Nucleic acid binder design. Sequence first.
DNA 1: CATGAAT
DNA 2: AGTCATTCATG
DNA 3: CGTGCAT
DNA 4: GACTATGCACG
Lengths: 222, 222, 481, 481
Amino acid sequence: KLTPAQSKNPAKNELYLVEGDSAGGSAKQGRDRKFQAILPLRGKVINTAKAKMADILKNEEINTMIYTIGAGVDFSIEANYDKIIIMTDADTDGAHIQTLLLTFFYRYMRPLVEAGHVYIALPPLYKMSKKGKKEEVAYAWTDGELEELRKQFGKGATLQRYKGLGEMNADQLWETTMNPETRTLIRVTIEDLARAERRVNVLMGDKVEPRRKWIEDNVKFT
Amino acid sequence: KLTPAQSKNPAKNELYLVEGDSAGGSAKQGRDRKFQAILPLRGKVINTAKAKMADILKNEEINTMIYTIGAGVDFSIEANYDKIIIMTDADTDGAHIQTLLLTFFYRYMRPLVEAGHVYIALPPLYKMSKKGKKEEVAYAWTDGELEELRKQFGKGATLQRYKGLGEMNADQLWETTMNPETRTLIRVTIEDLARAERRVNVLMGDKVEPRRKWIEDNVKFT
Amino acid sequence: NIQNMSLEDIMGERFGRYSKYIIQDRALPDIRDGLKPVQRRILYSMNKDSNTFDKSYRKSAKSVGNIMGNFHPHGDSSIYDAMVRMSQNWKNREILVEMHGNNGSMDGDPPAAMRYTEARLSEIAGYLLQDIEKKTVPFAWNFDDTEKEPTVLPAAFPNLLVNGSTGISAGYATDIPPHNLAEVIDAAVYMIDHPTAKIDKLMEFLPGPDFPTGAIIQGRDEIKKAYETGKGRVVVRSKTEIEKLKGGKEQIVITEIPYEINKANLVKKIDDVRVNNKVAGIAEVRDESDRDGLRIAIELKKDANTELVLNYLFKYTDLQINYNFNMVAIDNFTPRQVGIVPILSSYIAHRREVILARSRFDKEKAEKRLHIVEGLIRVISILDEVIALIRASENKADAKENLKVSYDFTEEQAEAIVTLQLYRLTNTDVVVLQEEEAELREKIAMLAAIIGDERTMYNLMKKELREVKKKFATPRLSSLE
Amino acid sequence: NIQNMSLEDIMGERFGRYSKYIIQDRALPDIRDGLKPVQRRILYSMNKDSNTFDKSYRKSAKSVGNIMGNFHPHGDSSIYDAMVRMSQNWKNREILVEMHGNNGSMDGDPPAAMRYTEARLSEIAGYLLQDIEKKTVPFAWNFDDTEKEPTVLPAAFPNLLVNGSTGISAGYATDIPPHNLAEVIDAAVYMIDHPTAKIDKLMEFLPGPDFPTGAIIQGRDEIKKAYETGKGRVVVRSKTEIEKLKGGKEQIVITEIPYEINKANLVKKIDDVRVNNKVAGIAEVRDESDRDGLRIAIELKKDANTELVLNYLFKYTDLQINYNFNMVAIDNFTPRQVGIVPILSSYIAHRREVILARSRFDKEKAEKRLHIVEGLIRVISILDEVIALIRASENKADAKENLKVSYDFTEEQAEAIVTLQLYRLTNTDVVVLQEEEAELREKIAMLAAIIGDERTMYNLMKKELREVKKKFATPRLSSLE
DNA sequence: CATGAAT
DNA sequence: AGTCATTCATG
DNA sequence: CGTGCAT
DNA sequence: GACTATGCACG
Ligand SMILES: C[C@H]1COc2c(N3CCN(C)CC3)c(F)cc3c(=O)c(C(=O)O)cn1c23
Ligand SMILES: C[C@H]1COc2c(N3CCN(C)CC3)c(F)cc3c(=O)c(C(=O)O)cn1c23
Ligand SMILES: [Mg+2]
Ligand SMILES: [Mg+2]
């Protein structure tokens, strides 16, 4: 089940795919309802590289995505949002979920990505604060930015490492990752196609022995 | 859903009504399956003094009791167990559940109680122990019995106060409250009828102002 | 292996146990600190765990597991939901737990599970706990008999009237509305000076409730009745504006709704009125509320029946509801139905006992330190001899006995002397000591004063009450008409 | 407010992160202590919380909330289920958590929620934790950066082979069967003496696995293959008896089933064979297992096709299954597929580092105490002067400096002297001190010996390993055919 | 038709 | 991590 | 067909 | 407090 935008406008309408019924709640609360819709995914998304077609279409998450978006899957295209934004935890499992959704969009909704309609959101990894009624807070996304903040807040200031979306309120979610003016998104492009297809199939695919090799070759577990 | 006895015998067959899906598990595990059946109640039982008939028969717990027992509710009688044993936590909520079930049996299955077929089980309130491979344990049910045990185990021995059935294993449940040879049950009788009916209606009934008075008169919250 | 009881006895004894517990230990608030046992345990636990406002939020699950394993023998869900509620500005006038994460909303959405959220006590909650470590308040054992728990909190403001309570047991129920901290304080203060404060004048300071949701409250007469007896019906009416709409269209705007109602559902029902056309001024219904503000837009079409249609909703939807006061609290271990006077008087009587006990505690601590300091002062004059005598003894205990017998020091004095470390000898200033002495002797006199002088005692209550007023006061949200 | 990445890069970097974490930090066991990160955190946490075997059980929820808030950033369900599993004698050969309450069963019933159960570490689990407070093992920071956690446990027996592990990540999976503590120990001990122990002789001590569920295991050749390479299929066959049945009827009885299978379901399928009459010896099927014993009765009717029908079940039901060894562990931060030799050798190499570090720690502690004791011995000879000098100084720091400069004591020595309490002067026995001195000097020599002598070191490993053998050894349950 | 500590 | 029913008082 | 840490 | 679907490897 999906939380709609108040108005229909294929031109400036945002579909947030959120990891968690719970974060989905927060996203619903903190957001411009005039034009952003929310669609939470309950747990891990089906792997559409490794499955049969039957299983895929019978899956609740996939079908609701398909229906809410419109096009289909052939796909057609513009219906029905001008941004499909994947919003998850900045942790390993969130990373896993982006992999799973991108595989889906890549395999079935391919034109969506090509026209640059698929984004990934960047929740802040850090919050800085310095008691009570006069508590001040800043947000940082990177190694460097944090370095910036700590010198500004100097000592006494304590740091939070966000372990997930659940840990932040609704206004915060707005301020840092949802408000078009202040938010920072990544835009997924494909440069080539064949290169992409190979990668997606080695990682997300049924066979394994190749994934293992990919991992031995590329994953540096030091 | 109910966990049956292996054989059908209206003569020596026990139906345990247990408070909790979870304790029901333990009871299933620790028990003589040759002739004792288990029927867990999920949460608070409908109050059958305060409800309409519709609500009552549409209730899952009541209907499964009725079906498993046989008779009906008119009742008829012997089908189908020779003991219906109410087994709950020795705490306030368990006490509440006994009230609710007795009201039901009293109001619909009345002959069951009259022929002395309804029991209440007495889980032990205390366990005594004195480390590791050589740990010894005893059980007590009362003010006095505990006094007995502590002198026997003397000092060093530590006492547990059972806050519920969940806190005890399956063999323990057998040893202390289910094994006919060692268990102690209370047998519910009715002495009079009118006296009973009045009490059940004042306590369990719809009106209230009288319950309040009963409480002001009899509950001594010091 | 078999006992017999009548059904008559089983019912009475069982039901009695359940009812008593439901009344005292579950559903109903103590009249003094305004708390139900779960709430109190939540606070007491988070505070003991140094999980206060001025430190980092902690993983809700840890707090709950801790409350559950030490104090509260019931389910995690019960504890956690109660916790969440204490963190909801729309339910409590002064929030007592601050939470990070999805913790519900007015549209009634499910709060996130304890495995997501993070919590801490709020600043004002620390005030309910103030002085709890100075033996100011009755303690009992937990179920383990492994630790002690408060039966009531010190309560440095009057939480009962402020956050209110509801409220369902056996035999009684309770509904108490939130009130404005500043106002309540003002009444209490008056009643301290004029104990026989009649209700009428009290109303002058404390008039009607103050809902977090704001809105409009009608029924002064009814409010008086509630504050007098314990029971009353008051009318609560959501707050409206009018907007003019380019094109000869008029818009109805709502910016505060009644306490305890599901905004999402209110909207749906307002819409349902339109679909079924139960009234004519119907047009479109839109909920346009975002982070940081509630806005409900019901804009009508041509025939702007505005005052007609608005009036219809007040009747048929919850845009207007009534609220009932049923003020029931636990006083002397038993349920009482109470109006403002008893509530205020018992709160005062409670602070009295607390302030007395606090002082008795601080006094004792001081006389003990004084007694020691007097000892040290003497020690200095005979230091060489005392050191010698100690070197000459056989062990700690023997040295102590020799100081007592020989120089007439007390046990507490000898113990303090004998445990001094060597570097302490580095300072043998009688003067520094005498200064401490004089300071102590003055703490003691002042405490002795608070203790044996109902008037100075009550003056302290007032000073303290006013300090809390300044720090936490906020303007009214509800209006009275 | 916008970046661009190719889908090619996003996938690679994301998947890489997930896989690495899944492999190291989630699904796979460390080759040394045989633990997955969740398990290790559970143990480490319960132990830090003094929730050991010799103290009272604690409310599961508290333990979990604690693990979750301090060490393990994942869901309570994951932690708790992992906890429950460590408490199941049918899944682990040596249980590491003891639990009170419904914690599942072989018939696969749902364990009770954490709000019901109570737990503590078992006795043998304390052995995995042995010496953890003597800096014997690498620590890292938790996610908060508020506390430190072990990356591996000291592991005083070889948990990997004993309890086994399974076992699903990205790219690799792991299945390791339980083994008999005593046997594993015996092999390890041999390998310590003869490092180049060939597999064949090792098998003589460690032959095939030992499932908690007992049963019968066939495939010596296959077992050799698994112990050699890492991979093998072995056959596991439930244990049967025959009963003669008054009336020319024969009964098939089963009293041990294969590892990791749902007894309730096994029964149901055996019954299903009868209903569909997939075989003729069919009669009645009954599960008659109670607390304290597993008994499965399949009694046949007239035409007692016993050996025929029994043989059919072994095929078509799980009364007989196969088990596959896929021994994958984390060695040097990366997944390796391993046979018995690498597992044993790395475990030994680990105890070496642990025993060395333990000794280095105990040595330092001792030399520090010695250094102080030597100081005290001197102090006594000049006590009067030293006391005087201290009285003459200006504060702690000044007295310290004077002792150093004047009598050449070290900082650590001065600090110890200057903090002595007065009663300590009650005893100025050089002799008592010298005794301690001699004792220390002997602890030190012996430690120095363990440290610089691979042989004595390895001898210690053996002594310790054998002590654990005597205390925890239990007879085999699985048989090898 | 719910409210909120309990099962 | 939703959904599902029930106690208890009350309007 | 199901295993067990994760969502 | 039960049930409900997914990833990951593998036989
Ligand atoms: C007591 C357990 C078992 O049953 C429960 C429910 N039912 C299952 C079917 N029953 C026959 C009646 C309704 C339910 F609807 C809600 C809860 C629930 O919220 C809950 C909790 O801890 O707060 C715990 N439980 C619940
Ligand atoms: C992630 C949340 C939400 O969804 C869950 C389930 N769904 C399957 C797929 N959904 C589309 C419908 C609901 C489920 F079947 C099981 C669990 C579950 O066990 C669980 C837990 O903490 O372990 C937590 N969750 C579960
Ligand atoms: Mg996460
Ligand atoms: Mg209970």
